[PDB]
Amino acid sequence: SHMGKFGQQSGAIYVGNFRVVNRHLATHNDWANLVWEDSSRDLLVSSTTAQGCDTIARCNCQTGVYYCNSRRKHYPVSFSKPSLIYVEASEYYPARYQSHLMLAQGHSEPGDAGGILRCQHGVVGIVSTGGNGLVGFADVRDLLWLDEE
Numbered sequence: 001s002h003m004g005k006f007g008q009q010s011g012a013i014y015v016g017n018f019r020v021v022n023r024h025l026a027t028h029n030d031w032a033n034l035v036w037e038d039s040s041r042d043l044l045v046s047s048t049t050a051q052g053c054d055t056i057a058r059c060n061c062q063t064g065v066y067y068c069n070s071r072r073k074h075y076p077v078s079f080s081k082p083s084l085i086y087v088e089a090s091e092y093y094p095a096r097y098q099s100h101l102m103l104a105q106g107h108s109e110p111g112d113a114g115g116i117l118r119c120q121h122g123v124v125g126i127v128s129t130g131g132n133g134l135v136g137f138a139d140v141r142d143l144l145w146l147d148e149e
């Protein structure tokens with residue numbers, strides 16, 4: 001019994017002809033094939049040729065399970081709704097307010113960004129931030145165009 005689906009953990013969400021990755025980890029190839037990006041959400045979407053098997057959740061769940069790479073293990077989480085959160089400077093961004101970010105208590109060290117959070121409806125978001133015993137997930141549920149055709 002689990003608080004969310006187990007699915008692929010490729011470091012990116014694959015749905016329809018889209019690949020959703022942490023903007024700060026997007027590869028040179030992602031940028032050559034850019035569909036959409038938002039620095040304030042730490043999200044980038046690039047285009048693909050082949051159908052991805054993830055389902056994007058369209059719910060208001062505040063519980064789910066994510067994969068933590070540093071522990072090589074899944075954890076159930078309770079997270080706050082998507083909010084505007086102050087994220088201090090890193091090698092990837094200056095200090096700024098990051099929007100659509102969902103906070104939970106959880107392990108999240110550098111390297112853990114890209115871990116996928118799923119509820120029982122599908123993919124909810126992707127690990128983006130960490131620190132002070134918290135893990136922050138970039139929500140993708142509001143992206144209605146992000147789907148299959």
Ligand SMILES: [Zn+2]
Nearest residue numbers: 059061119121
């Ligand atoms: Zn849900």
